[PDB]
Design a protein around this motif. Structure first.
Motif, PDB file in Angstrom:
ATOM      1  N   UNK A   8       0.816  -1.209   0.000  1.00  2.13           N
ATOM      2  CA  UNK A   8       0.000   0.000   0.000  1.00  2.13           C
ATOM      3  C   UNK A   8       0.855   1.267   0.000  1.00  2.13           C
ATOM      4  N   UNK A   9       1.898   1.280  -0.826  1.00  2.63           N
ATOM      5  CA  UNK A   9       2.806   2.418  -0.896  1.00  2.63           C
ATOM      6  C   UNK A   9       3.241   2.626  -2.335  1.00  2.63           C
ATOM      7  N   UNK A  10       3.487   3.867  -2.739  1.00  4.84           N
ATOM      8  CA  UNK A  10       4.084   4.116  -4.047  1.00  4.84           C
ATOM      9  C   UNK A  10       5.554   3.741  -4.040  1.00  4.84           C
ATOM     10  N   UNK A  34       8.245   5.203   8.416  1.00  5.37           N
ATOM     11  CA  UNK A  34       8.606   6.363   9.213  1.00  5.37           C
ATOM     12  C   UNK A  34       8.520   7.602   8.336  1.00  5.37           C
ATOM     13  N   UNK A  35       9.341   7.623   7.287  1.00  8.32           N
ATOM     14  CA  UNK A  35       9.368   8.754   6.371  1.00  8.32           C
ATOM     15  C   UNK A  35       8.006   9.005   5.738  1.00  8.32           C
ATOM     16  N   UNK A  36       7.223   7.948   5.523  1.00  7.48           N
ATOM     17  CA  UNK A  36       5.913   8.133   4.914  1.00  7.48           C
ATOM     18  C   UNK A  36       4.999   8.921   5.837  1.00  7.48           C
ATOM     19  N   UNK A  37       4.898   8.497   7.099  1.00  4.42           N
ATOM     20  CA  UNK A  37       4.146   9.281   8.074  1.00  4.42           C
ATOM     21  C   UNK A  37       4.718  10.688   8.192  1.00  4.42           C
ATOM     22  N   UNK A  38       6.039  10.815   8.072  1.00  2.49           N
ATOM     23  CA  UNK A  38       6.694  12.114   8.120  1.00  2.49           C
ATOM     24  C   UNK A  38       6.141  13.032   7.041  1.00  2.49           C
ATOM     25  N   UNK A  39       6.435  12.733   5.772  1.00  5.49           N
ATOM     26  CA  UNK A  39       5.951  13.575   4.684  1.00  5.49           C
ATOM     27  C   UNK A  39       4.441  13.727   4.706  1.00  5.49           C
ATOM     28  N   UNK A  40       3.718  12.740   5.237  1.00  4.40           N
ATOM     29  CA  UNK A  40       2.286  12.890   5.457  1.00  4.40           C
ATOM     30  C   UNK A  40       2.008  14.097   6.339  1.00  4.40           C
TER      31      UNK A  40
END
Ligand SMILES: [Zn+2]
Ligand SMILES: [Zn+2]
Ligand SMILES: [Zn+2]
Lengths: 112, 41, 89, 158, 105, 112, 108, 113, 778
Positions: G1-3, G58-64
């Motif tokens: 579920x990620x690009x 981690x980074x995904x929630x970050x940029x989110x």
């Protein structure tokens, strides 16, 4: 952002929807709005650039629609500032509704 | 492992029928016609 | 990007499509069709049977040389089937 | 006439099925259909953080009642041994999967479910049998001979 | 892999139903699942493909001597529209890292 | 209620259980299911912008009060046409005023 | 579920020249443990930084959440950093010792 | 050789009747009942009795959750895994077909102008 | 509201209408690519020892020895090529010692590059092994950390304490997320810096492209190489901007090639052409700049060749055709631009690479470079490769190379065909399967480009193949059938009599396989085998046609493209032998079938058939079914296309005046359709008239010419251009049959009625109109 810009652009397109041959200035407006669909991020950055800088705009045309009782003012702006202002408006109303700026007693309201 | 979600929410057959945004119907021009939603016959 | 193949001229007749139909190949002109085009089956084969010498469509006719290129004797060089400087297909 | 055919068949689950469908390893206790976080259920209750319902955890080391941290349940949670388990526990008696705590909807209510840890788990120093959701009420106590710790639950009020 | 591109030429061109190439058959339930993972077994593939129907009986080809799957199964449902649904739907699927293939027979 | 029963059943709702109310309600419930619904969720104050379109645009909008995209279509006149043709004496009634029998068409069912 | 294009590295910009790595570690430290962080000390690259985490999500929630997030007067530019590009400044080598080790210790 | 050739041959009956679509066959069977209706009900209208009870109400089967809609509307089997495994072509095929219906209408809206 | 909020992109609709992703899951590995004489036998043991010293690479050794078959010819060229393959330093040492021992014995009678692949595969065995013993998220090292980021950045600890927070952060990602936290805002009154790309103009930057072009954003200016990279942002002007900016920029960078050098350019380009967000156009444009700069730079590119190809090889496998011809072109320019040894010594390590993708696209690469520098120059390399004893994957690659050479070069393979065969033959018997399959396939491609000649060159290949034809199950079988298929036209009708009659059996039996690869192969086979002059009609009529129309004619086939075409061709040829009335007579009934594409198929088939054989063979009743079929199919047209029309026209013109009894039905349909609903079918019925003119003439039906004349005359007031054009065309065709003075709409009427139309703008009208004014005016 794309949502807002899209809405405003549709709104502008709605005045000309019947679209006879129109005229020159109107032609500029359709071509420029049409431009805004292809490269949205460009348009958004240009807009935010205006909003951060330009304090001097061009002259607005004025004409009177005739209701046979009371005349109605009608204003005409260059397309660029119309797209800019339009996005400004969709945005302002959106943030405003999110933040509950206007109390309920003001009722040309979306709900009803 | 089932694939679960809170509540149920809605099906699909309909969940995407009518156009989108589109906006009303011209400034309100006379030339438009458009009164009827479906053809006669 | 686009230049002649110039393989040895055979007995195979040239084939031009709708578009190129009237053109003399080298002079780019419609004037005085006289002699006939020859290209090698190395250039004309298979899917190239009745293929255009230029665009790659089916040949509806045969190219004729002008009288201009005739006297200057250019029609006698290598097969004038243009190859793009990638493959020919 | 001992074994007619040496292979026959199965009609049984495959390791790659249950594997792929649950992976952090493969895990057990897939969330039921109801599970929903507690904060958004406090949003449907129309509750800002002041009057909102947040379950905070309280720790007491079983030997000494005299916080290693304090834990919110609001952000289900996998109670396990430590990496796989989110709620890691230093207790050496906890099986690699010990238990789970899932908030469910019956209202947003907290629930504790044992995974069938080999030792078991005591609730108010009274154990519960495996494989059923057991609602927890505030001030109830959890401990994972093998109990090195204690736990308590609190709603946020006053 | 070729299937999905045939369904795209069938949907894109507006084929409109009964001329569909699932009408090629009308006589056949049994489906062909190739490229299956070797760990799989009867009860499993039954549990996954009873989704789109009720499977009556499936013979999965497993090598006679070693007694392990050769990697594919011929299946039989109770309903054809289950077959049409299964070929047109369940194909191009990932199982245990490998994409299975399905088609009529 | 239809949402709550769907929740307790865990089965999502189909079209048919909503076929009853499909066209009914002031928001015109079907407008929830508009494809572009996302975009419209971020539009606000539309109703007032329509009020001030009279100044931006020369033409006079009678429909200023509502918009089909937020409020749906609040009337269906399809009957009025049928009943109109009935009151005039049916296809044969109206056509009896025309040249139609001149065209020697077998029928009017194919008039285009 | 990620690009797929997103990576554990994030390019972060619109930073002040005075900014402290204390604020950096604190703020960015929400989403996960920092693998490490670099900051341009060079005339052109001053004002830019790269953050790397022990995990991508981690980074995904970050940029989110950190999307257009604010510091001082500034809204930081938060992008997922690219790959390849300029790499070969370093080399592929030093595999022999570690591979000999894993071939020694575990014997495999 | 009678009982054996009837094991293989009566298996030709068994797997022959099974082959096609056991689900399909029953639906065909229902039509046969319909013929029976014709013999007694030559031209039925309204209140005649079958219509009566007809409008007077308006084997494990899978339990859990819900089964996503299938063009043909078939509930999954007894022991079905209970998980959607699909290419999603049903939905999109399902969604796209619906979209066209919107398209025919907004196509029309064009015509009056 | 909250309920409507529970009910709570179009730019992503219109923006995605620009370009596309286009690609599968297989191709996206692109995104993972980071930037860059018996003493001659015992003497082969000696050379193996020395080169092995300077381990284990088989290829370079067989490349060295590969000069022996010319013996006494070999010369200093062997020093050049090998110069690139090993270190150019040791190169002078080894080649020198070799010529000494060679001349003496006669009288008396990159390494780092490969070192990396070995380590890559070894780590693959370590990790893969560990799981048995037991991805991009694998933890990293500070040298690996220094490997990714470019120059000029510092690592920071702020504290040791905040670092200890980062270490507890993992434990506290679970722990502190379960703890008290929240955010709020206060109402208070209120600087805002930012950067677009300003100078004068600087056309706009997409929000992502900043990462690449950030160096341009800063306005520090006017103080060496850093100013060349800084001024090299003219790229940005090529990528985004107005077309003139792209033009002028493109030239300006062309003439600065020799100045800036290939290094800075490619360093600043390859990231862009590698960008995950890349457009279609932007891609193509960067391809253009790479070409134009590679027309100049010649010796310079040598270090970057691989560093180029890695991005470019994905162009060879693509859905777009023009992309492919471009790619082949620029790799041609690169290989010819660089040196042979540069290419060879470059591209070896990609042969044994784990992924087959790079192996494949690399094979097509060798195809292109071999078209550049010619087959004989590159032969010893290949011939060395296919005999490599290390591993099979290599030989698989090299064989695929043989194939793609066959496709690319095609007809021009002819001279070296023998040597090529002599290479490939040894793979047919190999223990591995792939090598066998792809091998025989490559023979196929050869023979297909070998169209008939060089039969004996394939000679020694046959006897195994035929034998294999017996024993094989699955895809390899079909492949053999492909090869043999293309072979048979090249044999003698006597030998090929026997051999053919043997192939026919298996050919029959194998019609029924569900494999579509199968059906393609066996299809084209049936074309070649049964399209042989040495085959008897009746045998085909009995054995073949019934199963052929049974299994092959179905709605699985026609929906596909290639299967459609190939089916058409094969059926056409079967008609070419067994005759007309058979085939047509069996496929007529399908004109009335529901689906379009199927009707289209049988329709074009009938078209080509009656095109070649002629309509004379057709009897009466089947002709009634014909005309009715053609009208019926023509009456329902979902799309506009020629196939139905050209079909009808060819049918009628072929029937000649046998069609006369059918006219009134035709033209009745023609007028009634000539109304219908306008824009769709008017143009089509009109064109139908246009092509049926001569037939409506020679049979001398004059009333019909009155009809078409004045009826069509009336439509000249039609406002739809696309119709009107077809109308004028029809008039044209009617003028070429009935003469001037006999025109039922006398020209006095017609021509001035045409005159005002010339304003009509839209094209087809102007075309046909001016044409007709030409015919009458002439
Ligand atoms: Zn040539
Ligand atoms: Zn041409
Ligand atoms: Zn000329």
């Amino acid at each position: 952002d794309t949502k807002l810009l899209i809405l405003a652009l549709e709104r502008l397109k709605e005045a000309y929807s019947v679209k006879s041959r129109l005229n020159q200035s109107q032609r500029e407006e359709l071509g420029l709005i049409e431009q805004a669909y292809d490269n949205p991020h460009e348009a958004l950055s240009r807009i935010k650039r205006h909003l951060l800088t330009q304090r001097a705009f061009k002259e607005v045309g004025i004409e009177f629609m005739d209701l046979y009782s009371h005349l109605v003012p009608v204003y005409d702006v260059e397309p660029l500032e119309k797209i800019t202002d339009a996005y400004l408006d969709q945005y302002l109303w959106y943030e405003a509704d999110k933040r509950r700026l206007f109390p309920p007693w003001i009722k040309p309201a979306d709900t009803e | 492992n089932p694939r679960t979600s809170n509540e149920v929410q809605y099906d699909q057959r309909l969940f995407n029928q009518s156009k989108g945004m589109d906006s009303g119907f011209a400034g309100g021009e006379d030339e438009i016609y458009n009164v009827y939603d479906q053809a006669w016959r | 990007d686009l230049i002649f193949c110039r393989k040895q001229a055979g007995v195979a007749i040239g084939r031009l499509c709708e578009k190129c139909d009237g053109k003399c190949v080298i002079c780019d002109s419609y004037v005085r069709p006289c002699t006939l085009v020859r290209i090698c089956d190395e250039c004309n084969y298979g899917s190239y049977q009745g293929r255009c010498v230029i665009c790659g469509g089916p040949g509806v006719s045969d190219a004729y040389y002008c009288k201009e290129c005739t006297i200057q004797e250019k029609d006698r060089d290598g097969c004038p089937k243009i190859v793009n400087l990638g493959s020919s297909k | 006439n001992l074994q007619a055919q040496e292979e026959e068949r199965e009609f049984y689950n495959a390791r790659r099925r249950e594997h792929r469908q649950r992976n952090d390893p493969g895990g057990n206790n897939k969330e039921k259909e109801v599970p929903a976080k507690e904060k958004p259920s406090f949003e449907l209750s129309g509750a800002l953080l002041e009057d909102t319902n947040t379950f905070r955890g309280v720790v007491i080391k079983y030997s000494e009642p005299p916080r290693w941290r304090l834990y919110p349940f609001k952000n289900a949670y996998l109670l396990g041994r430590h990496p796989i388990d989110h709620p890691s526990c230093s207790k050496q008696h906890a099986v690699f999967q010990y238990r789970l705590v899932e908030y469910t909807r019956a209202r947003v209510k907290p629930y504790i479910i044992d995974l069938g840890s080999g030792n078991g788990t005591f609730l108010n120093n009274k154990r519960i049998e495996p494989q059923r959701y057991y609602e927890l009420k505030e001030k109830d106590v959890l401990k994972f001979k093998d109990d090195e710790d204690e736990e308590e639950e609190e709603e946020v009020s006053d | 892999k070729l299937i999905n591109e045939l369904n795209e030429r069938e949907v894109q061109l507006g084929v409109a139903d009964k001329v569909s190439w699932h009408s090629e058959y009308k006589d056949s339930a049994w489906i062909f699942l190739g490229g299956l993972p070797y760990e799989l077994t009867e009860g499993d593939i039954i549990c996954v493909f009873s989704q789109y129907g009720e499977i009556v009986n499936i013979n999965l080809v497993r090598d006679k001597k070693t007694g392990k799957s050769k990697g594919f199964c011929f299946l039989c449902y109770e309903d054809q529209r289950s077959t049409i649904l299964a070929v047109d739907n369940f194909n191009g699927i990932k199982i245990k890292g490998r994409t299975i293939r399905v088609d009529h027979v | 209620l239809k949402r709550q029963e769907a929740i307790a059943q865990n089965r999502r709702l189909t079209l048919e259980d909503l076929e009853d109310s499909w066209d009914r309600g002031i928001p015109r419930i079907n407008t929830l299911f508009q494809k572009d619904r996302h975009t419209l969720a971020y539009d606000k104050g539309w109703r007032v912008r329509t009020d001030f379109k009279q100044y931006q645009v020369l033409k006079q909008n009678p429909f200023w009060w509502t918009h089909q995209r937020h409020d749906g279509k609040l009337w269906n006149l399809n009957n009025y046409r049928t009943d109109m043709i009935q009151a005039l004496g049916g296809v044969e009634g109206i056509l009896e005023h025309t040249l139609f029998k001149g065209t020697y068409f077998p029928t009017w069912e194919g008039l285009f | 579920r990620l690009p797929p294009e997103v990576n554990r590295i994030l390019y972060i910009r619109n930073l002040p020249y005075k900014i402290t790595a204390e604020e950096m570690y604190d703020i960015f430290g929400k989403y996960g443990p920092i693998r490490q962080i670099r900051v341009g000390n060079t005339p052109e690259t001053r004002g830019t930084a790269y953050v790397v985490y022990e995990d991508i999500f981690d980074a995904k929630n970050a940029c989110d959440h950190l999307s257009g997030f604010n510091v001082c007067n500034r809204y930081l530019v938060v992008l997922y950093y690219n790959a390849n590009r300029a790499f070969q400044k370093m080399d592929t080598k030093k595999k022999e010792e570690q591979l000999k080790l894993l071939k020694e210790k575990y014997g495999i | 050789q009678r009982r054996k050739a009837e094991k293989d041959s009566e298996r030709d009956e068994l797997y022959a009747q099974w082959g096609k679509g056991l689900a399909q066959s029953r639906q065909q069977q229902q039509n046969v009942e319909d013929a029976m209706k014709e013999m007694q009900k030559p031209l039925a209208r309204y209140i005649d009795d079958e219509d009566l009870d007809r409008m007077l109400r308006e084997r494990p089967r899978y339990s859990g959750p819900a089964p996503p809609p299938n063009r043909f509307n078939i509930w999954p089997g007894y022991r079905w895994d209970g998980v959607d495994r699909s290419n999603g072509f049903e939905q999109k095929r399902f969604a796209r077909l619906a979209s066209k219906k919107a398209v025919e209408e907004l196509a029309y809206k064009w015509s009056v102008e | 509201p909250g309920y409507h909020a529970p009910v709570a992109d179009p730019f992503a609709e219109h923006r995605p209408p620009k370009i596309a992703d286009r690609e599968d899951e297989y191709k996206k590995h692109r995104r993972t690519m980071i930037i860059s004489a018996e003493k001659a036998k015992a003497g082969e043991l000696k050379v193996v020892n020395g080169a092995a010293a300077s381990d284990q690479t088989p290829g370079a050794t067989p490349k060295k020895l590969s000069s022996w078959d010319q013996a006494e010819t070999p010369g200093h060229t062997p020093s050049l090529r090998w110069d690139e393959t090993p270190g150019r330093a040791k190169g002078s040492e080894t080649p020198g010692a070799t010529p000494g021992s060679k001349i003496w014995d006669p009288t008396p009678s990159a390494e780092t590059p490969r070192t990396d692949r070995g380590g890559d595969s070894i780590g693959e065995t370590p990790t893969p092994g560990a799981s048995k013993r037991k991805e991009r998220n694998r933890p990293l090292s500070d040298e690996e950390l220094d490997a990714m980021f470019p120059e000029g950045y510092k690592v920071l600890p702020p504290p040791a304490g905040y670092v200890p927070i980062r270490t507890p952060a993992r434990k506290l990602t679970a722990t502190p997320t379960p703890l008290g936290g929240m955010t709020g805002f206060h109402m208070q009154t209120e600087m805002k810096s930012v950067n677009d790309q300003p100078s004068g103009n600087l056309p706009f930057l997409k929000p992502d492209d900043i990462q690449y072009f950030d160096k341009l954003l800063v306005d520090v200016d006017e103080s060496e190489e850093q100013k060349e990279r800084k001024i090299m942002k003219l790229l940005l002007k090529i990528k985004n901007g107005t077309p003139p900016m792209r033009k002028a920029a493109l030239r300006q960078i062309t003439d600065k090639a020799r100045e800036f050098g290939a290094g800075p350019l490619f360093n600043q380009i390859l990231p862009l052409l590698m960008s995950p967000t890349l457009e279609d156009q932007e891609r193509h444009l960067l391809v253009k700049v790479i070409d134009r700069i590679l027309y100049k730079l010649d010796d310079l590119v040598r270090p970057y060749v691989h560093k180029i190809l890695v991005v470019i090889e994905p162009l060879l496998i693509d859905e777009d055709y023009y992309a492919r011809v471009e790619g082949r072109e620029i790799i041609s320019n690169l290989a010819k631009a660089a040196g042979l040894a540069t290419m060879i010594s470059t591209m070896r390590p990609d042969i044994d690479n784990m992924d087959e993708y790079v192996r494949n696209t690399t094979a097509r690469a060798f195809a292109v470079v071999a078209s550049a520098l010619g087959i004989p120059s590159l032969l010893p390399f290949l011939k060395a490769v296919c005999k490599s004893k290390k591993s099979w994957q290599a030989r698989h690659t090299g064989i695929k190379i043989v194939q793609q050479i066959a496709i690319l070069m095609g007809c021009a393979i002819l001279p070296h065909l023998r040597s090529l065969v002599e290479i490939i033959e040894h793979g047919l018997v190999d223990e591995q399967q792939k090598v066998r399959t792809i091998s025989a396939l490559a023979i196929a491609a050869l023979a297909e480009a070998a169209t008939p000649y060089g039969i004996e060159s394939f000679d020694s290949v046959l006897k195994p193949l035929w034998k294999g034809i017996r024993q094989h199950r699955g895809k390899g079988l079909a492949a053999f059938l492909k090869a043999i298929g293309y072979l048979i036209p090249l044999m003698d009708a006597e030998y090929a009599n026997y051999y053919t009659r043997e192939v026919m059996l298996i050919l029959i039996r194998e019609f029924q396989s569900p494999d579509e690869e199968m059906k393609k192969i066996v299809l084209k086979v049936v074309k070649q085998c049964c399209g042989t002059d040495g085959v008897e009609a009746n045998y085909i009529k009995t054995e073949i046609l019934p199963p052929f129309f049974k299994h092959f004619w179905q709605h699985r086939m026609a929906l596909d493209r290639r299967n459609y075409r190939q089916l058409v061709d094969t059926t056409v040829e079967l008609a070419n032998k067994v005759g007309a009335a058979e085939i047509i007579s069996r496929i007529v009934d399908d004109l009335k079938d529901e689906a379009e594409q199927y009707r289209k198929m049988v329709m074009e088939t009938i078209e080509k058939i009656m095109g070649n054989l002629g309509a004379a063979d057709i009897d009466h009743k089947l002709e009634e079914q014909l005309i009715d079929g053609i009208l019926y199919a023509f009456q329902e047209q979902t799309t506009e296309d020629s196939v139905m029309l050209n079909g009808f026209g060819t049918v009628v013109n072929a029937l000649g005046k046998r069609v006369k009894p059918y006219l009134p039905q035709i033209c009745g349909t023609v007028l009634w359709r000539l109304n219908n609903k306008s824009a769709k079918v008017r143009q089509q019925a009109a064109d139908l008239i246009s092509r049926t003119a001569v037939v409506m003439k020679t049979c001398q039906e004059e009333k019909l010419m009155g009809h078409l004349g004045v009826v069509l005359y009336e439509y000249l007031g039609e406002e739809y251009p696309e119709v009107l054009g077809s109308i004028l065309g029809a008039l044209k065709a009617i003028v070429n049959v009935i003469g001037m003075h006999k025109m039922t709409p006398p020209i006095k009427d017609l021509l001035p009625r045409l005159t005002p139309i010339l304003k009509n703008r839209h094209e087809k009208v102007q075309e046909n109109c001016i044409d007709l004014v030409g015919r009458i005016a002439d």
